[PDB]
Amino acid sequence: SLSTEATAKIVSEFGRDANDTGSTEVQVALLTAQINHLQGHFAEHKKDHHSRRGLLRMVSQRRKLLDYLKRKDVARYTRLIERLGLRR
RNA sequence: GGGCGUUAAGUUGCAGGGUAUAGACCCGAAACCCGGUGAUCUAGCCAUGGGCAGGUUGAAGGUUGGGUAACACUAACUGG
Numbered sequence: 533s534l535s536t537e538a539t540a541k542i543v544s545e546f547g548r549d550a551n552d553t554g555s556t557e558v559q560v561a562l563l564t565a566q567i568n569h570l571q572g573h574f575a576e577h578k579k580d581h582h583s584r585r586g587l588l589r590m591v592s593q594r595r596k597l598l599d600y601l602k603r604k605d606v607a608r609y610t611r612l613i614e615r616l617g618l619r620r
Numbered sequence: 621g622g623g624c625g626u627u628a629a630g631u632u633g634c635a636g637g638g639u640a641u642a643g644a645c646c647c648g649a650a651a652c653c654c655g656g657u658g659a660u661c662u663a664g665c666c667a668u669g670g671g672c673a674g675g676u677u678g679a680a681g682g683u684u685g686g687g688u689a690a691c692a693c694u695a696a697c698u699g700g
C-alpha cells in the first residue's frame with residue numbers, strides 16, 4: 533500500500549491542511565496514485581490473480597465515491613479529475 | 621568247339637561322285653563384343669546478360685481516435 537511516508541505529499545493542495553485525511557478528494561488521490569504505480573506490478577508477474585482482486589476494490593471504491601460527490605457540490609469534481617488525469 | 625584272320629593285288633597320278641575342315645549354294649535377323657564420334661535437339665547443373673503492356677485485390681508494419689483501471693477490443697488513414 534505504497535509508503536507510509538508517501539501520501540504525505542498528496543494530502544496538501546487536495547486537502548485544506550495536512551491530517552485532513554478524509555476529504556473525498558484525497559482518498560481518490562491516494563487510490564489513483566497507488567493504482568497507477570501498481571499497474572507496474574501487474575506488468576511483470578501478471579499471473580498474480582489474487583493481488584489484482586485487491587486492485588479492483590481500489591478501482592471500484594474510487595469510482596463508487598467519485599460518484600458520491602457528483603451528487604453533492606457540483607464541479608467539486610470537474611476541479612479534480614483533470615487535476616489528476618482520469619475521465620477517459 | 622567258338623570269335624577274328626589265312627582262300628580275295630596293290631599303289632601313284634588324272635577326271636568325276638560323296639564326306640571332314642573351312643563362310644563351303646546365295647541373300648536376310650532381332651542381337652553379342654571391341655574401339656572410337658556425339659549435350660549445335662533434348663534432361664540436369666555452372667558462369668554471365670536479357671524479359672514480364674494494362675488492370676485488381678490490400679497481409680505484416682506505422683499513425684491517429686474510440687475503448688479499458690490497465691490489457692484485450694475496435695475504427696479510420698497510412699503502408700504495399
Ligand SMILES: [Mg+2]
Nearest residue numbers: 533534583586
Ligand atoms: Mg502487508
Ligand SMILES: [Mg+2]
Nearest residue numbers: 659660661662
Ligand atoms: Mg546449351
